[PDB]
Assembly symmetry: C5
Homo-oligomer: 391 residues x 5
Amino acid sequence: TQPALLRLSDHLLANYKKGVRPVRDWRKPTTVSIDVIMYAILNVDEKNQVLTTYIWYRQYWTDEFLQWTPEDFDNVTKLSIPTDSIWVPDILINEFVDVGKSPNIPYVYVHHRGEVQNYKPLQLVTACSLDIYNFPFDVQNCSLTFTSWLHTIQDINITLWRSPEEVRSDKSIFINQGEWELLEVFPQFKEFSIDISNSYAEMKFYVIIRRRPLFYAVSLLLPSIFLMVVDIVGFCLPPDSGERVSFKITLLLGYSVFLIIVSDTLPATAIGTPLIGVYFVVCMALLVISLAETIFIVRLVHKQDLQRPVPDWLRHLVLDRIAWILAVRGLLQELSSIRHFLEKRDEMREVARDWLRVGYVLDRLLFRIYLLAVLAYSITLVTLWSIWHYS
Amino acid sequence: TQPALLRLSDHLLANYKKGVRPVRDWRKPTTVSIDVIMYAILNVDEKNQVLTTYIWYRQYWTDEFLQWTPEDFDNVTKLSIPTDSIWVPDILINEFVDVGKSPNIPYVYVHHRGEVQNYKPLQLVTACSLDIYNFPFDVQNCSLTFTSWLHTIQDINITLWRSPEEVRSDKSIFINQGEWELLEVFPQFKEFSIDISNSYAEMKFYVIIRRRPLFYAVSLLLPSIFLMVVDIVGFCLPPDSGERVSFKITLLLGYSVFLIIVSDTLPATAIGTPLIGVYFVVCMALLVISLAETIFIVRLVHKQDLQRPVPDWLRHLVLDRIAWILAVRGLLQELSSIRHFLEKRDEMREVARDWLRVGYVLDRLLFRIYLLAVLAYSITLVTLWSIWHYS
Amino acid sequence: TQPALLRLSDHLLANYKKGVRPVRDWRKPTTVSIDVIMYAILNVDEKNQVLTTYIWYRQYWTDEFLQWTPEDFDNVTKLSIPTDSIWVPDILINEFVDVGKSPNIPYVYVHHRGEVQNYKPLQLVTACSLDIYNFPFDVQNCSLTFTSWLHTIQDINITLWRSPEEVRSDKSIFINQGEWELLEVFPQFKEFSIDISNSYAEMKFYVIIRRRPLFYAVSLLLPSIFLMVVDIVGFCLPPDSGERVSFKITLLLGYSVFLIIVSDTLPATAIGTPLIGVYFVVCMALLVISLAETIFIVRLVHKQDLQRPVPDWLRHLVLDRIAWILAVRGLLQELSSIRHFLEKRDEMREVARDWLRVGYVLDRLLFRIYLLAVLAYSITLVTLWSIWHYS
Amino acid sequence: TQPALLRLSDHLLANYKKGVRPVRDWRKPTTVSIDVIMYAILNVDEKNQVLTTYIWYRQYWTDEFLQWTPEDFDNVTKLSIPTDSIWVPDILINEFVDVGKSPNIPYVYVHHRGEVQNYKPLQLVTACSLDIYNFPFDVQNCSLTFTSWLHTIQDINITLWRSPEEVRSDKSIFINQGEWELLEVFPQFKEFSIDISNSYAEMKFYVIIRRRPLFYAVSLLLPSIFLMVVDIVGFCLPPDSGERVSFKITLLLGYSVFLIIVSDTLPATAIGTPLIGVYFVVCMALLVISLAETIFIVRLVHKQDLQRPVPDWLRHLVLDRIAWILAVRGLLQELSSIRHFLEKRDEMREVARDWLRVGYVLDRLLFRIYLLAVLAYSITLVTLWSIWHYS
Amino acid sequence: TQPALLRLSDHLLANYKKGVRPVRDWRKPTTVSIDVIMYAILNVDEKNQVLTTYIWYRQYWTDEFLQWTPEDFDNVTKLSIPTDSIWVPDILINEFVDVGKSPNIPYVYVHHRGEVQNYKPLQLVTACSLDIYNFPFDVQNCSLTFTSWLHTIQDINITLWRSPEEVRSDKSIFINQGEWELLEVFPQFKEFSIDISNSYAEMKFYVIIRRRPLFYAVSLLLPSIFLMVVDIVGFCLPPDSGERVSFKITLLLGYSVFLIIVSDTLPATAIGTPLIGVYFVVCMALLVISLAETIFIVRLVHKQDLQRPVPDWLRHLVLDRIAWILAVRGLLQELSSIRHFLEKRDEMREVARDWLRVGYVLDRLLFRIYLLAVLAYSITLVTLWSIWHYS
Ligand SMILES: *[C@@H]1O[C@H](CO)[C@@H](O[C@@H]2O[C@H](CO)[C@@H](O)[C@H](O)[C@H]2NC(C)=O)[C@H](O)[C@H]1NC(C)=O
Ligand SMILES: NCCc1c[nH]c2ccc(O)cc12
Ligand SMILES: NCCc1c[nH]c2ccc(O)cc12
Ligand SMILES: NCCc1c[nH]c2ccc(O)cc12
Ligand SMILES: NCCc1c[nH]c2ccc(O)cc12
Ligand SMILES: NCCc1c[nH]c2ccc(O)cc12
């Protein structure tokens, strides 16, 4: 003749009358507090300006109608009832691309003082700002908010329930060996108002996401230095052979088709410009001026219709090397004619030989100038790595 | 012995009887007003003729059955009740590709005068018209409507509640650094009727979306001028060497394979034709006539079976340069035979030399003509940029 | 003391008892009529044999239990009640790949005679037959049906409510500047029966969809004629130079890699064969026989181990051109030896010159034959365009 | 004063009490019968080991609580009631990748004997085994089951209601001109038990799916024979010209890049190996040995540092062709010196000519051997087609 | 006058009062046990750090309110009631990317002792850790948990109901011929607590997934050895011909474009580095040094401006081969001049011949050194296969 714990349950849930806002006085606003912790973060998308994450969520509010004494009710401090019976205030996240899918988990906590608690899992894919001005080391300053969509300041109040330093520095749960890592989150309470006499409660959390370069750094540094060092190899073969310019245009077309297929994949943005992309344009212009001096050296060496060398080429090159390091009479007539033809042919051959020599000398000089250019390239890389190492 | 605010709630919600249209007289139509503001806009698709956006939505109507005095009911002006109990008129958006996903947020406002309000978030992906006749600077004149699907003029009335200038010029909420930016929206109220005596209420909002070129302008202007300037480099090597035409067909195949892989990605439409695409066809025809004059210069220079030069080539070129800038007798017989063979060989060599010279002269002339063509290309680009800068 | 319009509502909805089929006599079948209009059509898929569309839907039936007089009930002819209370017969569409998503719009019309109406939006993505035998101008004869899934002939009757000519010719709502355009729809009422004594009602609508070629016609006609006309350019350079066959295999590999990447995209079918695809195979075989005659002309000209020309080559070519357009004695001995060597060398040179000449003559002849082949190609294109212009 | 047909309806549905298993005796198991017919089959996926289909489904069971006489109840044999009120046993399909989407169609049949029927449409995408050992002609032996997930043998009994031959041979509904065609389905009733005293009812249907080669057979046979016959063309040009090996490596790289891009698309599997894929490896090795003999013939012909021919090359080749088909004395001294130099040069030229001749002879022989290899290739193709034609 | 089995059903379900936690004493926690078996596993994704699987799930708990005697209640031991009426505790899986879709199957078991059972199918796609340090043979140590989200230790208790060895070794159901195979699962019960006095129950199952290499092993080993053995073929042609370096850069560009398109597909990770990828970089550097020695041999052989050979090249090579294996006077003057010119020309020709000889000797030596390098490559492959065969 003694009922179970459900006696208190149907004593409370007899006339709860959900759908009305539970207050003793309507002027006093109820308080629902916010708390968010980030369990994990999934992949982002730079095309859609969007990112995915999985955070654990918890909140509580004062229900104000559930009052019972701990004595003579079999010492009951807390119990479990479904969330469909209890009035639940709406805490809505903005800038979402779709509604977050989640299990129902229809259970909430209660307390004898009237405080009710709700622990729910909710994940969100949301669109916010991001920059790619430094793509290996980006700040990724995104924001996600928790506001009341339908209600005002005067009825719903949002607090923290924790110290802001404890929320700011919390690394209890986070999955490692991922591409992205957070260091801190930042709570902020600002009031939101579009027009006069309509101010709504808003709680904003700022996340800072650090991407770690381990794999894409090697995958970006390897093919550029690879094709540059095979270009350094491919300068060495002599220029009067015609396969050098075909080699270099083969290398140029290969670097072009590789540069097109890789620039759309990893910095896949519509508006932002990476710092590495202009560096690629500098590499393209450097390959272009290399092709231009190759064309010039190929043009400078030829064997047909070459005249005498100008004396300013001869005077400068010798200064460059020192700072660098009847049956008897008729037959004689025709034999002199044959000698004249052979002498003209050998004279043309010696002129072509001298043009080949001065072309070889200028080719060696311009190769050493390009080596100094590669040294400046390496100094730029070392300075960039030293700045990012100092941080 | 004094109840809470729920006394007014179950005084109102005792016999509300949802599902019937609440009027005192059925001839008088109720008024539901429209209001829309655009928080953000996501990406579009040119293939599916569709676009995505996220707008904040709000509306109100007269419920006509909820009447209570502010005096003696504890000064209650407004309160919150779920939207499932209240009759909600259907405001449906057309030309949608799927139903818009959204949270339920089951709460509405009421007032003592009978006016009820509903604030709901709804996003929409909808299919409308777009043109690509100017792809960097497009108008993007799309339309999205708010009509009553099931009801008529005579029962549901749609108004604005705001000035049309205030709706037309409103930039309170919009996310920056995106690819698309709106400048104004345009409200319009037109009646919709398919047959006789059936007119339905329709409210149409016209959006104008301006795309900003920052990244794709550089990404479209850089490779075309890049391959044209490396072609300008690649004209310089002499034509009698056979690697020039191989260089040019390598450049042509590279430009072709690049032009195919990039034309399907960014102007990804099935019907519309961009203005930049015909410009690409002009570039292809210009590269074709460059390849044609290259083939002509390669054909014009040869060393085997070349006859005497025609005098119209010789007369025109000298005018072009000035406006441009027994044991004793038998041995003599065989020696004369050897002289005859050597003289014939040297005569053929001199003829081939003259053909090489006139080919070189015509090659220089046609190169300068192509330089004038590049100047006309640049004048066209400067005129186009000047028109788009004047706007 | 006078109630509102809800008095008639709860006079009707007191004991409606949904879920039972409303008839006075069970032998008499109720009639639900069909009507469909096509607002818009979205993209199709040739891979999945499927297509998407958005049609406006409407239907009505006799509810037979709602009877009230217009007099003394405040002149009420029609009113609105939710569709969840009213028995709704199932009109199901077949050959669907998934359930169509749509808003609930839970409202229906009633009338005092008992006729109830329901206006609902429903879109459908459905799988049906299509052919690509003429891919620019296809018929696209698809079918979509409206049958009763669960009920029979004897209980549910399907009529039209409109003239079949008015349904057949109706262009009130359709979006323009799309890839697809319909000209007519065709209603048809056929009985459906799998076994004996089980006949079900079926209403079938046949849609005919005309695709308009504006963009893909240019995008398909431009690169083929482009590579053919650059081949016409590339025949001109002399064949004894070795870069001609490298040019032609470069063009052949480029046309092959372009033909592979474009044939999988636009005619993306698993079974059907387009008429344009065999035309591409004819183009490939024509490029192959061009490469074959190029290889033959390259083989026919050589300078080492060439014998005397056969007289059938010499007799045919001269007919082709006319219809086309001691110290004194020993030194003499060794000098005669040197003369013998030089005479042998010049004889071999003259033989190689004659082989070069006859190769050049045959090359010009075969080039003119290929020009006649291009004329036959153009006649085929003009005949095809004339047939499709006559229609 | 005479009610409608709903009198029998609320006589039956007063105390039906859904959720309890309807039996008069709990020891007697109720029988729910199975029946499945395949309306259509959609595409499959070889990567995800999964396939899609659309089957029509029907089943019935004995409800045992609905008993009414046909007399004095207005001759009612059958009527329609919603499926939410009637107890529905769970018939669940296994190896599904997601829950099948379907309309609710909430209506079932009843009968006066107590037999209730349910006709529902359900489509399924399910993962099962498949093999690609013969990819044009595969068996595709997949299985799909209908078991009771929650209940046992002792309460739910599964029968057929039709002859197994009539289920095995049924072609009433199937869409033609698709890639896949079934010839028969196979019913099988096996008991399923994991541990002792827990046996569950399982009904398994085995489907056999025949793929028809019309388009991909041509699309697979055309490019291989295409590149082989253009290789047959490309053997013909002389080997001492250097463009032959460049031609052949161009063809080899083109065939390699085509073979990579096509082998990942159509036989897109992770584990299974097709028979056509090893055939492609045989083609690659054949192209490799062709490139190897090409390199050997290019190496065998050279003009610098060639010694005398070995006599085993000279003896074998002549057997191969027959079975195949003071001022007076000093000037004489220097003239003899010039004769010595010219004689040495002509001797070296004749040696190089003989090496060119024997290289040409061996090239013709190896070309005819490769022609015999192409004949063996064709015999293999004819034998394969003859076996698949005999079947 | 004797009711059916539903008498016990509405004797039990009269006042069950769902939503309250059923206990006689609130201090005593109820026990819900866990059990999981893996029916099948679908594909994984290395990009999203996620994997898909389909497991069969079962659990039971003590309901504590359903008590009835087997005698006089018609011998009823167990019966079936819907799961919506019975209180169901929440067992939630973490690190999920979306909610798992599943049928409702709303039926549970009961027993006369009070024990209720629930058999439900649930599949899950979840994100966990994985490594690619050995991509053909990986451990794939993933974890999936079963915790109570809302409740504590003090109210919900999780046990096993089976021996841990029987759970660890269970291969009753698993689909074969897949890419992945499990060998064991590992249960573990650890307590989960974020702050003080809040400890929650957690049950963790560790799965170990072994991937089998059959197809991708051949698909990865075949093209690398293929291009290396065609490089071994392509070393053989003489280096003074210019097509060798064009051949090798054609092979290098083909291997580069193949290496780029295949490295993004199969090891598609953002952070992890495979062991095969560095092996590919070693192959690229080996091809680079092969191209470098090819460029060196091409540079070493030339015919213009070659001086006398240095004696250290001549002394080392002869040691390398042995360990390896008036009208009368004027005409005489001009004839001596012609002899001087011919002697100079022949001297230059002999010097160029000697340079060609020493280049050929060094080329053969470096080819044999590269053959020893290929032997070291093969020894590395054999050692790797021997280690993975020993395991
Ligand atoms: C599209 O196909 C349907 C059938 O697939 C055609 O319908 C036929 O129409 C003729 C005359 O209207 C009837 O005699 C046939 O019985 C119909 N066939 C069937 C199976 O019902 C329809 O005519 C086709 N449309 C066009 C434009 O040709
Ligand atoms: N802060 C809740 C969003 C919000 C503020 N003002 C609003 C006005 C209209 C609307 O739909 C939404 C809002
Ligand atoms: N304005 C609501 C659309 C509309 C107007 N007339 C209609 C007729 C039928 C239908 O399904 C829809 C409509
Ligand atoms: N409206 C066609 C319904 C239909 C006809 N025969 C059928 C057989 C089985 C089934 O589930 C459904 C059907
Ligand atoms: N035959 C229904 C599947 C099945 C058999 N035994 C089972 C045990 C547990 C479970 O969840 C499912 C099953
Ligand atoms: N083990 C249940 C998850 C859990 C433990 N502590 C929590 C705190 C907050 C929260 O949202 C979730 C949790």
